[PDB]
Design a protein around this ligand. Structure first.
Ligand code: HEM
Ligand SMILES: COC(=O)[C@H](c1ccccc1Cl)N1CCc2sccc2C1
Length: 465
C-alpha cells in the first residue's frame, strides 16, 4: 500500500524547502492547498501523515479509534518525559494512567469538596483580589495563571497557594516562561533537526532546565505527602497514587512508580495551568473588541443567575448565549493549532493508504475549528455559530477544540467548568474597559506554535453595583 501524497524529501533535510518561514501551521496549511486533506511531509528524516478538516480528523480519531490512539512526542520536551507520565505514555502504561487519572480527579481532594465547589472558591478569591486593584489598569496574565493553577494544585497537591506567595509566583514564572519557549519559533526548528541540534546551546536547554526545576518541587511535595500520609483518609491525587503504590506491591507489571507519578503531576500541573488560562485571556481580549456581546452575556447572567448568589455550573444549561460565547472563544482562540502529535498503533488502512505502525500523525485541529464546510466566515468572532433561530445552543461537528477520540482531553470537564465559572463570575461582578478602542484590538498571537499565545494587553476591572 501507499503513504499519502506529498512533496519529495531530500534525505536528512526532508522537506525544509517546501515549508514556510511563518511556522509549522502555515507550512502544513500551505501544503493542504496542493496535496489535499491527508498528506505526508518530512520533518528531518521522519515521515508524518497530516490530517485536515473536520472530516479527515473525524475519520481517523473516531472511526479508527484504537488505530489512532498512540501518542507521538514534542522533541523539545521529550528529554523530560521520555514516554513517562500520562500525556506521553503509550500502550499499557497509558491505558493504566489514563484510567486512574479520570477516576482520581472526579473524587478525592482538598476539603473533599467537588471540583465545582473548588473552582467556585477560587473564583471567590479572584473577585476579592480584583476588587483590591480598585479598577486600576492591570495586565491579567499573572492572575489568570494563578487561578487555573490553584485549581490543579488543589487537586494534585491537595492545596491552594496565595496569589502573592513567592514559592508559587516562581512556579508560575517557570510555567509561563516555558510554555512560551515551548511554542516559540526555535522549538519548531528543533522539531525538525532535534538529532543534530540537541548538542549546541539553544532554547530547549532553558526548557529542560525549567522543567527539571518543577520536577524538583513536584518531587519535594511527593515526599511531604508520603511522610505525613494517612491510609484511612486520602487527601488528594498524590495521596491516592501512593495508596495505589501500596495496593500494588505484589504486581510486577504495575505502572504506578515514582517516574510516572512525578511526570503525571507535571503533565497535569502543566495543562491544568497554561491552557484553561490563556483561553480566559483571549476570551477577555475578545470581550474588549465586542462590548455588545459582553453586555448580552452580562444581561443573561443577570436574568438566570442574578447578582447575589455565585454562579453555579447548573446555570450553564439555562444560559445558552454565554455558553455560545465560550464555545466561540475556544473555536477562534484555537489554542492548540495542530493537536498534540499522535502515532498509529498498528498498520492502518486510511482512505485506501497504508500508514505503517508507529508513523506520526498530526491532527490539525485548527483546520477543523476554522473549517469553512462547517463554519461560515470562520475568521470572524460570532457566537451565532452556536445558536439557532430560537437562541438555543446548537452543536457543531467542526467543534473539537479538545481533540477527539481515545486520547480526547482528560481535563475537558475541568477546563469547561473553569471557563464557565471564571467568565461568568468575573462578568457578574465587574465591568471591563481598556484604553484601546474596540476597532484596533488585534487578535494576532504573540506566538503561534504547538500552542497559540495571545498578545499582552491592558484591561481594567470595574466593580459593578
Ligand atoms: C480549555 C483548556 C484545554 C484545552 C483547549 C485542552 C486541549 C487538549 C488537547 C487538544 C489535547 C490533545 C488531545 C489529543 O491530541 O489526543 C489534550 C490532552 C490532554 N489534556 Fe487537555 N485541554 C485543556 C485543559 C486541560 C486541563 C485543565 C487539564 C488538567 C486536568 C488537561 C489535561 C490533559 C491531559 C492529561 C491530556 C492528555 C490526554 C491523553 O494523552 O490521554 N487539559 N488537551
Ligand atoms: C502543546 O501545547 C500545550 O498547550 C500543552 C498541553 C495543554 C493541554 C493538554 C496537553 C498539552 Cl501538551 N502544554 C501543557 C502541558 C504540557 S507538558 C509539556 C508541554 C506542555 C504544554
Amino acid at each position: 500500500g501507499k503513504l499519502p501524497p506529498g512533496p519529495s524529501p531530500l534525505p536528512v533535510l526532508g522537506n525544509l524547502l517546501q515549508m514556510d518561514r511563518k511556522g509549522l501551521l502555515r507550512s502544513f496549511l500551505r501544503l493542504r492547498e496542493k496535496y489535499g486533506d491527508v498528506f505526508t511531509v518530512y520533518l528531518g528524516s521522519r515521515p508524518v501523515v497530516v490530517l485536515c478538516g473536520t472530516d479527515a480528523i473525524r475519520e481517523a480519531l473516531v472511526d479508527q479509534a484504537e488505530a489512532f490512539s498512540g501518542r507521538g512526542k514534542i522533541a523539545v520536551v521529550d528529554p523530560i518525559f521520555q514516554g513517562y507520565g500520562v500525556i506521553f505514555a503509550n500502550g499499557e502504561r497509558w491505558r493504566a494512567l489514563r484510567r486512574f487519572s479520570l477516576a482520581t480527579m472526579r473524587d478525592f481532594g482538598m476539603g473533599k469538596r467537588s471540583v465545582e465547589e473548588r473552582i467556585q472558591e477560587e473564583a471567590r478569591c479572584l473577585v476579592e483580589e480584583l476588587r483590591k486593584s480598585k479598577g486600576a489598569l492591570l495586565d491579567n496574565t499573572l492572575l489568570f495563571h494563578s487561578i487555573t493553577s490553584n485549581i490543579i494544585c488543589s487537586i494534585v497537591f491537595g492545596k491552594r497557594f496565595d496569589y502573592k506567595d513567592p514559592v508559587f509566583l516562581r512556579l508560575l514564572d517557570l510555567f509561563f516562561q516555558s510554555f512560551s519557549l515551548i511554542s516559540s519559533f526555535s522549538s519548531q526548528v528543533f522539531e525538525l533537526f532535534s538529532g543534530f541540534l540537541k548538542y549546541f546551546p539553544g532554547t530547549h536547554r532553558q526548557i529542560y532546565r525549567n522543567l527539571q526545576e518543577i520536577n524538583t518541587f513536584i518531587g519535594q511535595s511527593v515526599e511531604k505527602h508520603r511522610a505525613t500520609l494517612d491510609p484511612s483518609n486520602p487527601r488528594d491525587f498524590i495521596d491516592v497514587y501512593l495508596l495505589r503504590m501500596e495496593k500494588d506491591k505484589s504486581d510486577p507489571s504495575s505502572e504506578f512508580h515514582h517516574q510516572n507519578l512525578i511526570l503525571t503531576v507535571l503533565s497535569l500541573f502543566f495543562a491544568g495551568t497554561e491552557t484553561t488560562s490563556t483561553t480566559l485571556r483571549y476570551g477577555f481580549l475578545l470581550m474588549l473588541k465586542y462590548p455588545h456581546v459582553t453586555e448580552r452575556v452580562q444581561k443573561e447572567i443577570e436574568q438566570v443567575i442574578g447578582s447575589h448568589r455565585p454562579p453555579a455550573l447548573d446555570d450553564r444549561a439555562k444560559m445558552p448565549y454565554t455558553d455560545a460565547v465560550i464555545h466561540e472563544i475556544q473555536r477562534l482562540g484555537d489554542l492548540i493549532p495542530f493537536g498534540v502529535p499522535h502515532t498509529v498503533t498498528k498498520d492502518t488502512q486510511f482512505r485506501g493508504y497504508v500508514i505503517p505502525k508507529n508513523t506520526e500523525v498530526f491532527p490539525v485541529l485548527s483546520s477543523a475549528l476554522h473549517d469553512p464546510r462547517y463554519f461560515e466566515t470562520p475568521n470572524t468572532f460570532n457566537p451565532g455559530h452556536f445558536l439557532d433561530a430560537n437562541g438555543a445552543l446548537k452543536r457543531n461537528e467542526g467543534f473539537m477544540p479538545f481533540s477527539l477520540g481515545k486520547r480526547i482531553c482528560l481535563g475537558e470537564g475541568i477546563a469547561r467548568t473553569e471557563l464557565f465559572l471564571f467568565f461568568t463570575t468575573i462578568l457578574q461582578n465587574f465591568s471591563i474597559a481598556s484604553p484601546v478602542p474596540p476597532e484596533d484590538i488585534d487578535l494576532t498571537p504573540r506566538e503561534s506554535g504547538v500552542g497559540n499565545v495571545p498578545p499582552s494587553y491592558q484591561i481594567r476591572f470595574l466593580a459593578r453595583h
